[PDB]
Amino acid sequence: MTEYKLVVVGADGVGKSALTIQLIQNHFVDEYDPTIEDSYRKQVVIDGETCLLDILDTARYSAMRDQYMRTGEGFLCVFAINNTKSFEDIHHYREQIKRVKDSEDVPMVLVGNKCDLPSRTVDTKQAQDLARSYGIPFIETSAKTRQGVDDAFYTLVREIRKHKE
C-alpha cells in the first residue's frame, strides 16, 4: 500500500485547512482555528491506483512538523484569488521548501483558492506566469464548492510519481 506524504503551505487565511478537510471529510468547514496544525490520512484511488494520502495542514517545536518537512514528498503552495498579499507571499514558501529539500526539483502545485468569490485580484494569467516560472502546475480551487479540490491533491500526487522515476 503506497503512501504519499503531502504538506499544505501558504499564508494565513487562504484556505489550507478548509481544503484539507474538504478533501478528507468531504465538507466545507466554516471556522477552523488558524493556529492548529495536524495530519490527516485517507485511502484514495488516484488514476486506478489505490493509495494512502498523508497530509499535513500547516499553521506554522513539533517533531511531526519536522518529519513532514524532512520526509514529505510534495507541497501544495496555496494563495487566495482575492488576496494579493497571499500571492505575493508565495515565493517565500517556495524558497523554504527548496532549502528543506536541498533541491530545485521538489514536487509542488501552485493552488489559487476561493475562486467561487467575485472579488478577484489575482488573475489567472498572473498565477500561470508564476507557475511556469517555477515549472510547477497551477490549479484553481474552491474549498467551498469542491471545485478543483481532488484535482489539486491528485495533481501533486502525479508530480510525485514523476519525481520517483
Ligand X SMILES: Nc1nc2c(ncn2[C@@H]2O[C@H](COP(=O)(O)OP(=O)(O)O)[C@@H](O)[C@H]2O)c(=O)[nH]1
Applying CB under 6 A, the residues found at the interface with ligand X are 10, 12-18, 30, 32, 34, 113-114, 116-117, 142-144
Scan for cell 533541491, then name that residue: 103
Q: Is 20 in the site for Mg ion (CB under 5 A)?
A: no
Q: Which residue from 4, 5, 8, 17 is in contact with Mg ion, where contact means CB under 5 A? A: 17
- Of 11-19, 21-29, 43-51, 65-73, the window that binds Mg ion (rule: CB under 5 A) is 11-19
107 binds, options Mg ion, ligand X, none, Cβ within 5 to 8 A by partner type: none
Amino acid at site 145: T
- φ/ψ of residue 104, rounded to 5: -80, -20
Are 9 and 75 a contacting pair, CB within 8 Å? Answer: yes
Residue nearest to ligand X (CB): 15
3-class secondary structure, 127:
helix
Q: Which residues contact 134 (CB under 8 A, 6 or more apart)?
A: 94, 108, 110
151 binds, options ligand X, Mg ion, none, Cβ within 5 to 8 A by partner type: none
Are 57 and 37 a contacting pair, CB within 8 Å? Answer: yes
User: Rounded to the nearest whole angstrom, what is the least distance from the CB of residue 28 to ligand X in the complex?
Assistant: 7
Residue closer to ligand X (CB basis): 17 or 155 = 17
User: Rounded to the nearest whole angstrom, what is the least distance from the CB of residue 63 to ligand X in the complex?
Assistant: 21
Are 156 and 30 a contacting pair, CB within 8 Å? Answer: no
Residue closer to ligand X (CB basis): 116 or 151 = 116
